[PDB]
Amino acid sequence: GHMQLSHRPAETGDLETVAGFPQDRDELFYCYPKAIWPFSVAQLAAAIAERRGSTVAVHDGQVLGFANFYQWQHGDFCALGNMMVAPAARGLGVARYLIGVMENLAREQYKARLMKISCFNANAAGLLLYTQLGYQPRAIAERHDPDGRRVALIQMDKPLE
């Protein structure tokens, strides 16, 4: 970089790339808690079919980020999920960029007034990023990780404009 980011809807040809993004069971859990390790293109595709707005971010010809909505409620809110970033491109602004693109889509396509993001407690980088982007914590929910251990899901939101 400097980063020259663009975006477009995800395509089947991007699946293998994106499914390569989670580097360990923790990372997969944070972005897709219902997935099973190891991740696969079939699991990623099954998410995409269940969700809306699956979008990739591109720089220098490489797909470096992916996101979608897992909830969408017209005139109300969307909730962002599957936020994934290529391991060679962490900390370079890819998630920031894609979250802004997703906010625009939630406003424009769903007339959303609010974006919800939920982030697991262990993901400090995620919690600090969403904080920088104007998200505020609203609640904490209990969830369980694949080892049956109790984790805290921090439920955040942000008004859209």
The answer to the question of whether 119 is labelled as a binding residue is: no
User: Is there a binding annotation on residue 128?
Assistant: yes
Confirm or deny that 15 is annotated as ligand binding: no
CA 118 from centre of chain: 10
* Mode of pairing for the β-strands spanning 114-120 and 136-144: unpaired
Residue 144, marked binder: yes
Query: From CA 137, how far away is CA 157, in angstroms rounded?
Result: 7
Q: Assess contact for 6 and 57: CB atoms under 8 A.
A: yes
Q: Would you list the DSSP string of 119-146?
A: EETT-HHHHHHHHHTT-EEEEEEEEE-T
Is 50 labelled a binding residue?
no
* Ligand-binding site membership of 142 (annotated): yes
Q: Is 148 among the annotated ligand-binding positions?
A: no
Whether residue 149 is annotated as binding a ligand: the answer is: no
Tell me if 85 is assigned to a ligand binding site: yes
Q: What radius of gyration do the chain's Cα atoms show?
A: 15
Pairwise CA distance, residues 103 & 97, whole Å: 10
- The answer to whether 83 is annotated as binding is yes
Binding site, annotated residues: 7, 31, 59, 83, 85, 91, 93, 95-96, 123, 128, 132, 142, 144
Q: Which residues are annotated as a binding site for CoA?
A: 31, 83, 85, 91, 93, 95-96, 123, 132
Report the binding-site residues for Zn(2+): 7, 59, 142, 144
Which residues sit in the known binding site for acetyl-CoA?
83, 85, 91, 93, 95-96, 123, 128
